[model samples]
Target: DLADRFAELERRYDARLGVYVPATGTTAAIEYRADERFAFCSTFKAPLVAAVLHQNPLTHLDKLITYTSDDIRSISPVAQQHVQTGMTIGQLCDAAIRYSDGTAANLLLADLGGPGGGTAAFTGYLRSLGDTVSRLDAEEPELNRDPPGDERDTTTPHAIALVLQQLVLGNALPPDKRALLTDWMARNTTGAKRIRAGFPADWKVIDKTGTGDYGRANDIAVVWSPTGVPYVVAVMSDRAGGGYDAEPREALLAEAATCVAGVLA
Candidate 1:
């Protein structure tokens, strides 16, 4: 009944929608179908961190992961600086997860073996976990374009929510890795209106926001409610104009969140 309510709401609010709700506090949760699907923008990089951390427990948080020009190009904001020296794996993961910093994401993605020789890095991780879904299956994937422009980066809301559970349950990631995953999520910056607009101010909303050209905007996030309720959300869509800010879209998400929270509680 709760899931059905949300399904009707999405039909009214969006052209397409996909929702996955985890069982809260032992009550079995149901995933809503027809949720959004689009390029991952920056949220996918968070899993890259979990994948690497699961493979190796850092002896020291300061362990360095060197950067290359190709890795530099992976992130959009810091692409041109040609940064010297290297950052700790822990630090890079933080930047990538918290700020949705593309520069930091690419650096970690390369060290973990993403594109440019690390392609096997993420691919291998997914295989180990038994989730055959492609993490980033491109010869050279770039997510900086609008919809109908590129096909390199993609995700279904269902898939992302599943990843969140993999991190939470310590099933796919090691214990330390799960801790880091939730910690990074707590700092996610994609809040204000889109997916997080409906909760009370005191609610703990951890999420990431993504933007691209040609009417592409998305949010994939999990909310840890004040009463110990927790849920995950993913909203992806193509708007008409480029450069549309996320605040307005966030309100729509907030409405969905409000309904889900009330039902779960």
Candidate 2:
């Protein structure tokens, strides 16, 4: 009922906004431009890694993937330290979700078939979930592009929310894999200021944070209510003409979280 708080930010940021909250005891599930498209940014890594686990959780995850200095990217803090030792597919999941490391995402995409085909494989995975509009046009770095009116690498708030709800509470992935996924999300270290900051200190939040060109600040999360019911909350926004070099304002996202949290309570 308090979604108007989100409206205020949409106006102040001069940005487009999308949100989807599944029903809880306090309020029915809600929407704000729920089906409208917005760039996904690194938030896609949650499902990107999930699809890989769906294939064969045991063998592939334990498998160690080796990459030399040429394979490392600057944003890849964890992978950079492990160059000589390489990293397991599971560890890469930690890097991608916990650190939002660009190199780790490419590694998983490579296992999914690489950009040449990972684009198709990734999109097809979303399609398999009956998510018609969520698309991944390219791999990371390039995948972060959010040009005006371009639809590639975009997801509707409703669509991505469903993905997280299913991954966290439904059987989209095996139960063990689901546990692994949430474990990484709950401990994510990329940015502590977004969704987490908006929540009550005792509340449980397993979230993925994302930033991109054109003032994009996105956070997709699963929040646990006071009585232990889990509610899925997703908020995505980008400021108009904020320019390509704009650092995503985490303040904007935190404010949105505060609004959604009040309503959820």
Candidate 3:
């Protein structure tokens, strides 16, 4: 039934959709285009944060890290507010995850030794989870530079979902760090109009969104119904012919959420 619902949304938008429910195991979840890779965009930040947390202790989260022009970039007002100043790693993680701040992510990547090193860290973590499909290839402004046409940085819906899945299943980070990451994502304001919009008031959803050039709108989330149902769903759509119009993509994400909700119900 979930397959038909996702199919309906995909048909309505004329775009591919992907879903994976770790709660049900891979064989039992929806998989519409789950193997197709798409621009990762800011969704990569969550994995980046996971890598940083793994290399550092929980105490390092509050350690202050200064911002330079290198950390400052375009497209995120949250990072703009902190240029030429100091903020803890925890705060940067907050900005990166909650607001999808570009500067914060760049700063974190720089701390991890630039794009190559940062991606290496993230992929290393993914390797432990038996994942290899996701790849982060560039830094902030560069990754965000041109329209991500298929080469910049890429990830599949399945790969993205596993990041959250591993964290939720306690296979990735320590308990406290996992909670810290999930807390920031749960309170994210960036995807309110996307996945969160489709849920009832009592349902709890923690998610991260990715928006790139060429009308890419994506969100990977761990959704929890008030009745205690839980699932991981990742929806990514590249409206290449639709310009930058966000309404359709956001609506698609909402529809996917609704579909998943009905299934869990």
Clashes of each: 14, 0, 0
lDDT agreement of model 1 with the native: 0.62
Ranking by lDDT: 2, 3, 1
Error (Å) of candidate 3 at residue 260 is: 1.6
Error of 3 at 140 (Å): 1.6
Q: For each candidate in the order shown, give its overall lDDT on alpha carbons.
A: 0.62, 0.84, 0.76
Best by TM-score: 2
Better candidate by TM-score, 1 or 3: 3
For residues 1-265, write the lDDT of model 3, one tens digit per residue.
Answer: 6678778887788776766655474336667778887888788888788888888888888888876666466667676666667788888898899889888887787677744847676666777777777777777756643453565477788777877788765568889888888888888988888889887879888889887766677888887779776788888887666554434357888878777677667
lDDT, candidate 1, 1-265, per-residue tens: 8667666765555424455665656766656653344566665676777776876767645787666665554444433443576677777777777766777765666667545556567766766765455456542235545345344556666666776666764477666667778888776665567666766777777777766544455677776767765666666655434333422244555677777667666
Of 2 and 3, the candidate ahead on lDDT is: 2
lDDT of 3 at 25: 43
Better of 1 and 2 by TM-score: 2
Tell me the tens digit of each residue's lDDT in model 2 across 1-265: 4567678787887777788897756678888889888898898889988999887747778889999999775478888888899999989988899999889998888899845748888898988887999998887687777586899999988999998888889889888888888899988997689888988887888899888888888999998877887889888888757678766778777788888877777
Off by over 4 Å in 2: 1-3, 24-26, 114-117
Tell me model 2's lDDT, rounded to 2 decimals.
0.84
- Model 3 lDDT, full chain set: 0.76
What residue runs in model 1 are displaced by over 4 Å at the alpha carbon?
A: 1-15, 24-37, 65-85, 114-116, 138-141, 144-152, 240-248
